Symmetry: D2
């Protein structure tokens, strides 16, 4: 941490760069979390200056008047380099610009690819070919999409593998940076009270939920090509499945943890359409932005088939999980914002309360209002002896009010400086993900089934509820 570090924002000119990456690296700098000797270098097609990037990005910093001195130090340690994405000369200028930086030939190089997936191969080759420290380490941060299926992801993933070792590749699933998501492991493996119950003997099912109350909101053109499954299920929701299901690792080292995650996936068969319900939101007449359907987006092809809601049931066919359905439910334009892990436990054996009991559930609400609670039965207070539902809760907000939770990107980026791959997608992890959904996704493309309509603002298709019931979920 006494070494010089260079943080290279590739695609500096872009919106992600201006709205998220620059301010994220400001907040780590601001808070004194980065190495002392850190430089930021933007690179993009445009011919820009640090001055111009500051105008673009400084609105987004949430900067105060007492950070004026820090803000200027920060911009002092910024520079820019105009260049093209497959132009070997451009990378030459970039590499010697970096070398000209205080101890640049020594410095650890960190490349954030804030760019569309179409330039990834170009960029990763050029970086490898001409921008790599000879002394320092070189890490590369990459966002999704990682291919569109197993075949496309493999093409990309072999390219990069040919160029970089796994310990230089940091693929991002930003859910891996959320407070409650990271906390899953601690909940499970720090506590004895959650050990003996975490298996097929006690859990009737697991429900992994992703919901947003807004639709595609203008930009449904980008979405139409991807779909809800690819956008949210194959990545975020399955990451959570993995943390929920993984065996306990020997250590917290990055690859012991990821070995367990990938082991979970290897245990899961390809999804059969039989277990999938799809949905597409239509407008709501009885309601501004909610009045339009998915299709009333001008950016979305007429008569499109793309699903904005998917409910899918998976199985982890191993000793601990066999037969226990994992229900993955996701969609946009729904009744709420929520991201949630919910385990529904089995009924109690030998009931002595004449069926009045309700299944216990452990609930880890990821957002909003981060909390982890158990729904359980207690004797109805007062002059009664009938049990009733209640819950023991750890609601972050009451318990920890003062504390401010860092943003996923703040956490993750810091891990790249610190070298922790634990919270980043590995290549095997990545391909197991693709082989689980790939047959279904080709099917869909091939058979192009009409999603089930769902009115904007509802909980999604009734048929999704019907499915969950069929594999042994219980609504109460």
């Amino acid at each position: 941490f006494s070494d010089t570090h260079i943080f290279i924002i590739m695609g500096a000119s872009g919106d992600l760069a201006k709205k998220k990456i620059y301010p994220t690296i400001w907040w780590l700098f601001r808070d004194g979390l980065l190495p002392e000797n850190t430089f930021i270098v933007g690179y993009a097609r445009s011919r820009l200056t640090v001055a111009d990037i500051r105008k673009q990005s400084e609105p987004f910093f949430k900067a105060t008047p007492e950070e004026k001195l820090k803000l200027e130090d920060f911009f002092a340690r910024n520079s820019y380099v105009a260049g093209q994405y497959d132009d070997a000369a451009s990378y030459q200028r970039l590499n010697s610009h970096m070398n000209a930086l205080h101890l640049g030939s020594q410095a650890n190089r960190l490349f954030y690819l804030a760019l569309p997936p179409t330039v990834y191969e170009a960029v990763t080759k050029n970086i490898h070919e001409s921008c790599m420290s000879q002394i320092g380490w070189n890490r590369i941060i990459v966002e999704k999409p990682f291919g569109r299926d197993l075949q496309s992801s493999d093409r990309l993933s072999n390219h990069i593998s040919s160029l970089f070792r796994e310990d230089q590749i940091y693929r991002i699933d930003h859910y891996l940076g959320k407070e409650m998501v990271q906390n899953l492991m601690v909940l499970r493996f720090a506590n004895r009270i959650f050990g003996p119950i975490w298996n097929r003997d006690n859990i009737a099912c697991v429900i992994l939920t992703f919901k947003e109350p807004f639709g595609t909101e203008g930009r449904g053109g980008y979405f139409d090509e991807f779909g809800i499954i690819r956008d949210v299920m194959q990545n975020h929701l399955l990451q959570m499945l993995c943390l929920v299901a993984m065996e306990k690792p020997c250590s917290t080292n990055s690859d012991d943890v990821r070995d367990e995650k990938v082991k979970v996936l290897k245990c899961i068969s390809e999804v059969q359409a039989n277990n999938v319900v799809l949905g597409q939101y239509v407008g709501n007449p009885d309601g501004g932005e909610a009045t339009k359907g998915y299709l009333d987006d001008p950016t979305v092809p007429r008569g499109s088939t793309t699903a904005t809601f998917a409910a899918v049931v998976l199985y982890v066919e191993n000793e601990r999980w066999d037969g226990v359905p994992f229900i993955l439910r996701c969609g946009k334009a729904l009744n709420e914002r929520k991201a949630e892990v919910r385990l529904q436990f089995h009924d109690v054996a030998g009931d002595i309360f004449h069926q009045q009991c309700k299944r216990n559930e452990l609930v880890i609400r990821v957002q909003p209002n981060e909390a982890v609670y158990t729904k359980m039965m207690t004797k109805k207070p007062g002059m009664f002896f009938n049990p009733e539902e209640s819950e023991l809760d750890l609601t972050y907000g009451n318990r920890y009010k003062n504390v401010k939770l860092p943003d996923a990107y703040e956490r993750l980026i810091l891990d790249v400086f610190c070298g922790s791959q634990m919270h980043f997608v590995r290549s095997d992890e990545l391909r197991e993900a693709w082989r689980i959904f790939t047959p279904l996704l080709h099917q869909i493309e091939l058979e192009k089934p009409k999603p089930i309509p769902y009115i904007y603002g509802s909980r999604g298709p009734t048929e999704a509820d019907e499915l969950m019931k069929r594999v042994g979920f219980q609504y109460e």
Copy 2:
């Protein structure tokens, strides 16, 4: 419940009768919980009138101005009968007074013995000999002490057994009427989340705690004869042990439940002095009432040996519990009021967090501020990955604010009308209790060891803490 009931307060003239029993039966009447056709009959040595009892007791009723009509109906359904406790004629007048009551020869008779233990034999014989309904049922409510040891309790208990069947005898441990105490069963057998963990594989120990911040406060003369163990441990604390430890019964019928309780006790060997630490409170110089010791009570014999604090460790030598110490800790003049069940779970197997973990605990606070919470580990919020202690809680007060909790005596008495023995001490239950402590208690009487002093307002003798540590409790 359409039958006439007579509630006979034996010892009506006494303080318990005036401070607790009369007002308790008022509150059940007030709230419309008793049978419509209920009569209250006081019986005591004094020559009194309903008028006099009303003057004595009505202060204690918490009566309002809108209950004026109910208060008069209540006193209308009262009467008194002056009589002596071993005088056959007195019981004759009482029995025909009862007969003269609307359907008195039919009426179900309920006898509350609000009397010292010295008259129990006299009274129960006379009642049986001359006061028993021929048509209705006859139940008898009895409070402690039930003997002073196995031998004395057996003498009393054979007397009453000769006279009444078990289903006519309602022995009271008022702890059995507390909200959280009753709730133990529902916590355990309604929930799956507390099933798999409730055994020797997961629990390192159980701590059953009884504490009061006041001393004997003048009346240490009555206490000196009994001692903390007999006063609190042999009854209340062991009742809780039983509810904590009992196997799940087939049904909630009174005798299935009590079969399980008595089964637990049969599994417990006699306490050896080796596992007992005793204590006697001395005054605190640095503090009104706290300035005096136990011995500075004028009502307490000079140089007494009686213990006001006892810590004892027991074992339930069966499949589920073998080796798991149950720590019973009790005493007066301590740092707080608390009654509490605390299970301390074992460490987690295969720790991956470098010893930073702390043992989980499940805590059912009986009083004050009734609650049930789990102490567990959560990932330290914010930019950390180190677990820290936290808890999920169900605090009655936040969750159920509006609800008012009935008093133990309100609950129990109602059960006597309804005929539920589930919450009353059975004779076998009673004698198993005595055989567990009887050898120790005779020892004490015989060897009269000097209790360990403890300053008023402290947590009790350090040596108690030393003991708990020795059998595998962990302070953190």
Copy 3:
């Protein structure tokens, strides 16, 4: 054991007395297992002599020439007393005959009732009224049938309860005296390897089997009144259910054990006809004694409905067993002699051998050729990797060859001298047994359904197999 004991064979003149009881008490005497000072007194209607009883019974003794001295000592310690069963004078002579015996007024009195059930009340009253030692203890041995249903059994059982305390009543189920039957407890509670698996998580079902290859063989007249259920299922098979299912007791004391047995039963609902298949054997044309059906017995009413085969499924609705069917299968004139406990375990979770696995079973063969074995899977020996069925066995015969196993009656009678009720039916035990089958038995009497025919020498009705399959047994 230095006291005088008198063993009173009531019904000495009868066949059971001559074929079993006399020789049984000879073998205990022969082997030096009885108290030194033991007398045998026969009592029956006939006017007999010790000489006559010796002629009747000595054939059955299996006596050798070196036991000549023991045989004469034995008959020396015999006497007889002619008397009637409800004649107060007869019991007077019997009681003073006993008194005239060396220390007879002191001697412990043991009454074996080798008599039909119709005289039980008469006999037990007279014994109590006039034959009871004032100094020694008095025990009474009683065989089935104990009533024909709950109501009749209660009448008998209240009679005897009025007269004798439970610790004087020794009701017999001779299955309780079989080597493998007694061994159940040791198998279960001595071994750790059979603890964790003994519950609803691992056992798919339990099959308790009773079979005989012979029919009623002439005496089907006595049987017609009783039926297979009453004859074998309500007693023997359910005793085995109890030993299989009971929780572990605290100690091996007689009443801790029996408390657990009766606890199991209390947990079982009344059998519904829905779970019962009945059978009656018809003759086999293709085969001496096997050529006749049940009905071709001259002693059996024409067109009788009595079942010689019953398959019934029961549930023990508690924490450990809930949902696990206990299949009780019994019948006469079947393919073999066998008495057997067979637990069929569930499939393994997360199968890695492509369905080639078979459910494990633990098997305790009670008779013939006493053994306890596990059927399990082993890698097919040789150049293979496919698992196949095999078994680990403890076959008594190979392992213990020299040892001769005492007869049930030898064991039990000795327990009556030693005072061990552990292996005898208690009154609560008895009535729980009756309430489980009583509704079904009245039904049958009322609706008189035609049993399903089954050819002599077969395994019984196909429909029985169909039932077992329906509640989750698997034939492989």
Copy 4:
């Protein structure tokens, strides 16, 4: 399997080649287990002919007169090639000799390295450089030793990794080819009866035993350089530890299985000398070959320190195993031949048999007389109620008599043709093995402690027994 295969015995001239490899490949050929179109090619320094190799090896074949036709076909499909081990020309002749073989350029090439470890690098390079099929697959079989410690093994292992992919490298631990050793997985994962008990809650320890009744018997010169640990413990015994301890894999694919094995090892800390007892055999005066010690070998350096017996205790620090000692006991010149896995289960909770119980054990005897049995408690047969030790056994010999068990090398070699790496040591597997023992082995070399003497024919040092006792083994 319709392809041509070439089996290249490198070091054909050697004793292993003549005594084991040639006859092994004969027996697979003889039994029709190899591909139809198989050629055998010997290569060694000597200038030999097929004729000469046949003279050398045919004694060892166990050939009959009816295999005369098969024996000639076999030798017809043999050839030889004289060559040196680092001579590029020699490999050129070998590669074109192979090409000249019916479809040789197509044929799958199988290289058995029947050679000392000193030529491994030379040979594997030359093979890679010039002998590799362009069409067929090329596999290489390699025996131990694989380095002498982590550093030496890494040098070798990086060499070969540079040249060949893991799926071309077949490292041998011949224990992996033994019937009972392979059967471990089936025992564990095919059966439910061994699932719930296979963890730290039920197992007090595991004892992995290797013993031989003969010493080094002349060739103690080769041994002196290696030692018992390196010779037997680091490989065979730890392989068995792995099969005993591994989590259940998702599938039986080679790398799922090996992932679990290597996962076990990663969970094991480096052995501390504190847990090691070492031994060296001295002669026995009271006994031919047993009269000499290790040191009385002329081939062994005077005053050597090498251990012929090692007892070591290891821990697998994970959820399933934490705290359960794995006792590895091995040595030569001992009281017997035995290779054995023995699990000793914990005592039963809540003993009701007054300490008469003994710990249960599951025993898988690998050799001699292959068997798997459980030692357990049964009620002492006859007129007793005291439990005693007994066992349920599956003894191969009684149960499977006719069947002949193939030799480890027969099994393994066949797997190389079939392409199953499941039973071969992987590189990670290999290095985890080395890091566990490497610190201890350097210590020993450095501190050269004097092993504890042990008389030839005994069970080894008393101190080994003392150790086992200290970590919670119980001798009974």
